[PDB]
Amino acid sequence: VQLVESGGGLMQAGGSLRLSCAVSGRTFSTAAMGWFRQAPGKEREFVAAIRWSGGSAYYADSVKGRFTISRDKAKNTVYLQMNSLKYEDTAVYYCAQTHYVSYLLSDYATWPYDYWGQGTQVTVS
Amino acid sequence: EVQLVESGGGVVQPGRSLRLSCAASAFTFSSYDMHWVRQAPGKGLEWVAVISYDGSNKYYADSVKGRFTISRDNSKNTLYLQMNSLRAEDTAVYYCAKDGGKLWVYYFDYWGQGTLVTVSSASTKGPSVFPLAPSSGTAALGCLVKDYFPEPVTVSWNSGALTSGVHTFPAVLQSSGLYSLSSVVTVPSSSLGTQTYICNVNHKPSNTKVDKRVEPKSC
Amino acid sequence: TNLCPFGEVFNATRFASVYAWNRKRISNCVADYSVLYNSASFSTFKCYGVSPTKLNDLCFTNVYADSFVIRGDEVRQIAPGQTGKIADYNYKLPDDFTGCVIAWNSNNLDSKVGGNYNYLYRLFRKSNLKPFERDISTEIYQAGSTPCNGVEGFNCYFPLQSYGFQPTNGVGYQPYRVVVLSFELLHAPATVCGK
Amino acid sequence: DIQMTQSPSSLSASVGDRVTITCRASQSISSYLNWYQQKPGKAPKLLIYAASSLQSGVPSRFSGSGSGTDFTLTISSLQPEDFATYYCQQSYSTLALTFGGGTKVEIKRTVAAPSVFIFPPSDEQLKSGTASVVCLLNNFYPREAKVQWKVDNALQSGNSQESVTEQDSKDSTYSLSSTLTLSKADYEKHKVYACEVTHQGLSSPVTKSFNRGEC
Ligand SMILES: *[C@@H]1O[C@H](CO)[C@@H](O)[C@H](O)[C@H]1NC(C)=O
Ligand SMILES: [Cl-]
Ligand SMILES: [Cl-]
Ligand SMILES: [Cl-]
Ligand SMILES: [Cl-]
Ligand SMILES: [Cl-]
Ligand SMILES: [Mg+2]
Numbered sequence A: 001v002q003l004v005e006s007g008g009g010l011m012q013a014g015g016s017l018r019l020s021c022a023v024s025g026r027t028f029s030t031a032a033m034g035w036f037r038q039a040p041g042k043e044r045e046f047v048a049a050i051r052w053s054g055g056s057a058y059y060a061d062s063v064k065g066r067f068t069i070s071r072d073k074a075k076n077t078v079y080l081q082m083n084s085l086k087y088e089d090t091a092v093y094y095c096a097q098t099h100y101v102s103y104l105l106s107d108y109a110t111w112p113y114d115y116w117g118q119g120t121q122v123t124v125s
Numbered sequence B: 001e002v003q004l005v006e007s008g009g010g011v012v013q014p015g016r017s018l019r020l021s022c023a024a025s026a027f028t029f030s031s032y033d034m035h036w037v038r039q040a041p042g043k044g045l046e047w048v049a050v051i052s053y054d055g056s057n058k059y060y061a062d063s064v065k066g067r068f069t070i071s072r073d074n075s076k077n078t079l080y081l082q083m084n085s086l087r088a089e090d091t092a093v094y095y096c097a098k099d100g101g102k103l104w105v106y107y108f109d110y111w112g113q114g115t116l117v118t119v120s121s122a123s124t125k126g127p128s129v130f131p132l133a134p135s136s137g138t139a140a141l142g143c144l145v146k147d148y149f150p151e152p153v154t155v156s157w158n159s160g161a162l163t164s165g166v167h168t169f170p171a172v173l174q175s176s177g178l179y180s181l182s183s184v185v186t187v188p189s190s191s192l193g194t195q196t197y198i199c200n201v202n203h204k205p206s207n208t209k210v211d212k213r214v215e216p217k218s219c
Numbered sequence C: 001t002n003l004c005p006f007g008e009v010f011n012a013t014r015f016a017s018v019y020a021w022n023r024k025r026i027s028n029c030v031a032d033y034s035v036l037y038n039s040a041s042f043s044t045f046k047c048y049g050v051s052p053t054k055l056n057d058l059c060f061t062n063v064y065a066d067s068f069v070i071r072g073d074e075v076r077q078i079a080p081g082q083t084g085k086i087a088d089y090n091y092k093l094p095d096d097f098t099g100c101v102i103a104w105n106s107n108n109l110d111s112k113v114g115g116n117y118n119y120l121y122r123l124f125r126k127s128n129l130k131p132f133e134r135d136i137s138t139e140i141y142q143a144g145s146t147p148c149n150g151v152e153g154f155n156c157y158f159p160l161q162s163y164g165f166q167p168t169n170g171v172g173y174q175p176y177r178v179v180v181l182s183f184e185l186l187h188a189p190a191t192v193c194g195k
Numbered sequence D: 001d002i003q004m005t006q007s008p009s010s011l012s013a014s015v016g017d018r019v020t021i022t023c024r025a026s027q028s029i030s031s032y033l034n035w036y037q038q039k040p041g042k043a044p045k046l047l048i049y050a051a052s053s054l055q056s057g058v059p060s061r062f063s064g065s066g067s068g069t070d071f072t073l074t075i076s077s078l079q080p081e082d083f084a085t086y087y088c089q090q091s092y093s094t095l096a097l098t099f100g101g102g103t104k105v106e107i108k109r110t111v112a113a114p115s116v117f118i119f120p121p122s123d124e125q126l127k128s129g130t131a132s133v134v135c136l137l138n139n140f141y142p143r144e145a146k147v148q149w150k151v152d153n154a155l156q157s158g159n160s161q162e163s164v165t166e167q168d169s170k171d172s173t174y175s176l177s178s179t180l181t182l183s184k185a186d187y188e189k190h191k192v193y194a195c196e197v198t199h200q201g202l203s204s205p206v207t208k209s210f211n212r213g214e215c
Helices: A105-109 C034-038 C085-089 D123-128
Strands: A002-006 A016-024 A032-038 A044-051 A057-059 A067-072 A077-083 A091-098 A120-124 B003-007 B018-025 B034-039 B045-051 B058-060 B068-073 B078-083 B092-098 B115-119 B128-132 B139-148 B154-157 B166-168 B179-187 B197-203 B208-214 C022-026 C029-031 C044-048 C062-071 C099-105 C120-122 C160-162 C175-184 C192-194 D004-007 D010-013 D019-029 D033-038 D044-049 D062-066 D068-075 D085-090 D103-107 D115-119 D130-140 D145-151 D154-156 D174-183 D192-199
Touching: A002 A091, A016 A032, A016 A091, A016 A120, A032 A067, A032 A077, A032 A105, A044 A067, A044 A077, A044 A105, A057 A067, A057 A105, A077 A091, B003 B092, B018 B034, B018 B092, B018 B115, B034 B068, B034 B078, B045 B068, B045 B078, B058 B068, B128 B208, B128 D123, B139 B197, B139 B208, B139 D115, B139 D130, B154 B179, B179 B197, B179 D130, B179 D174, C085 C120, D004 D085, D010 D019, D019 D033, D019 D085, D033 D062, D044 D062, D068 D085, D115 D192, D123 D130, D130 D145, D130 D192, D145 D174
Parallel strands: C029 C192, D010 D103
Antiparallel strands: A002 A016, A016 A077, A032 A044, A032 A091, A044 A057, A067 A077, A091 A120, B003 B018, B018 B078, B034 B045, B034 B092, B045 B058, B068 B078, B092 B115, B128 B139, B139 B179, B154 B197, B166 B179, B197 B208, C022 C062, C044 C099, C062 C175, C099 C175, C120 C160, D004 D019, D019 D068, D033 D044, D033 D085, D062 D068, D085 D103, D115 D130, D130 D174, D145 D154, D145 D192
C-alpha cells in the first residue's frame, strides 16, 4: 500500500498549485484520504480530507475557501487545489490513507491514518 | 404402556461429578430423540439437553453447556447424562422424556418419575428436636426439627396413634445449608395434663431416631 | 457426489459486513448436515421452527445460507423478535422464521494489531428493514431539519460505521462469523434433501 | 431469550366449572405451545401439544386454542382428578425450550379464619445458642395470608421464612409456619415478640404476642 506525492515546488504568493497523490496496492480498501502539512519549526497540522464514498470533504479553517480536495476513484488519486497561496502555506505536504469508516466526517481531522507518503515540498514566495 | 426409569441420583459436593441413567421400555427407543428435564425444589421445569435418535447430535442449554454431557446406548435401551462440575444451581429432580416426533419441533411425549440430585457442601447432620409448649377454644403444640441434612425426616405423633389434627410442614433450607422443619398438632384444651404427647422423629440418612416429651409451659 | 457446498460457506476465506450480508442459494444437492454435528468449534447454535436432529431426514425446496460478521453483544440479535442496531438496520429475521443461526468466535482471523476496520455496519436508517432485506445504500442520513444534499456536516452523517476489532478486545467486542440457514417449503419440487 | 408468562398465578374453582388458563409469550410462536399437568409429587403429563392437538389418552374435556402469543387451555367441565398445577411450554425456540410459571388449580371453598398460635423458643434450644420463634396459622383459605413479625414494635423482614402445606384432603384448608430464627444475643436485646396476621377472613389484623421470660 504505497502513497506517492507530486506537484509541489516553488510558487509566487497569490498563485495556484495542484498536488497529487498516487495509491497502489489494496486500492479498494480505501475509506478516506487526507492532506497534512508540517513546517520545520512547527508541528504537523491537518489540512483537508475527503471520504472515498460519496466524496464529501472536510477542510481546516486555515485553508477553507482557498483549498479544494478531490479524488478520482477509477484512477485512485487524491488532488489538492491550492489557490491564493500565502507565505504561511510553506510546508511539506503529506497525503494519508485509511480504511477506517467513521460516520462523522470531522473525525478524519484527528484520526491516525494507516499509510503516509514521503511528502512533497511546497514553498511560497 | 411406555415406561422410563431414572436412577443414579444422590447427594454430591460442588464441583464433583454424577452419572444419571434412564431405562426405556416397550417402545422403539433407538428411533426417537431423548431429552433430560430438571425441576428445582419448589421452582418450575427447565429443559436440559437433547440427543438424536442415533446418538450423533447433542444439544444443551446455555446453563449447562460445556458442563454436562448426554449420551445413549441403544443396545441397552438406556439414556445417560453425565453431570460434571456440579454447582448449587443444579440441585433439581431430573426427568427423561420421549420426544414423539409428530411435529417439526420438540415436545415431551412420556415422562419418567425422575431422580433427585442434590448439590450441597454440607455433611450429614442429625436433627435437633425441640418442643413447642402450648398455653391457656382449643390449643396447639408441636415439635421443631431444626438443623439437619439431607432430606427427608419422618415425623409421627404418639408412635402413630395421633393422626387427626396433625400438620407437618415442608422443610426450609436455611442459610446455614441445613434444613429446618415444623410439625404441630391441635388437641382440645381440656386434655392437656392427662394425655401424653411425644413426637417421633427419624432421620435415616443420619440414622437418628428421637422422641421428645412435649408438655405445657409451667409458671 | 453432488453434496451441498456448505464448506465454501462456512470455510470461506473472507466474510462480508452485516449491512451487505452475503446470501448463498442451496439447490439440487444432497444436504449433508454432519459438518454441523461434528464441529464442536461453534459458540452459538440456536434453531427456530425446526429441530436439527429431525433435519437430515427432511426435504426442502430451497435452503438459503446467509453469512456476515458481527460482535458478541450483537449475536443475540440474530433471532426473530429482536431489536437493536443489527436487527433493525442491518439484518432482520421474520417472526415466523424457520431455520438455524450459527456463530463462532473469529478473533484469530478478523482482527489486526492495528484494528480491522473492513467490517462495517449501518448506524442510521429512516425506517426498519423488512425481513430478509439487504440495504447497501450510502445516502447521507438526515438527522436534523436541514436537508442534506449528499453532503455531510451538521446533523448530516454517513450511515455506515466501522467495527473496531483488536486482539485485546473484550469477548463482547470480538468478531463473530454468523451463518444463518433458512428453510422454505413451497408447492414446488424439493431439490434439497438430507442424508 | 423467550419468557413464558402464565396467568393467573393461581385460581380457585369448584367441580364442573369452565376452567380457562392463559399462556402468553414474549414473542411470536406459530403454534408450538404445549400444555402439561403435574400432580404434587408425581411427574408431568402431556395434555396438549402444538396449540390445540389433544394427546392420545387424555379426556375430551381438555382443549387448547390460540395462535401467536396469546394461548388458552380450557377444561369444559372440571372433574376431581384435575386439581393440579398446569404448565405451558413453548417449542418455537427449538434449542432453548422454556416453560411457564404454572397455574395451580385449587379447590374452591368458603373462607376460613386462621387460628394463630405463637411459640417461644424452647429452653433446650437456648442452651445451644440459636433461638426460634414459631407462629402458626392453622386451617385457613385461601393461602393468601400475610405474616408480619414485629419485635419491640419494629417491623422485621428477612429474619424468618415460611412454609405452607398443600390444600387439606379433609376440609380443603392451608396452614403456615413462620420460623423467626436469630441468635441468643439478639434474643435478649429485645422483649416483645409479636406475630401480626392479615387474612381475607379477618375483619381486622390479629396479633399474638408475648414478652420474653414472663409466661
Ligand atoms: C472446514 O475446515 C475444517 C478444518 O479447518 C474441516 O474440519 C471441515 O470439514 C471443513 N468443512 C467442510 C464442509 O469440509
Ligand atoms: Cl486559479
Ligand atoms: Cl423393549
Ligand atoms: Cl441405532
Ligand atoms: Cl427462490
Ligand atoms: Cl412435584
Ligand atoms: Mg418452618
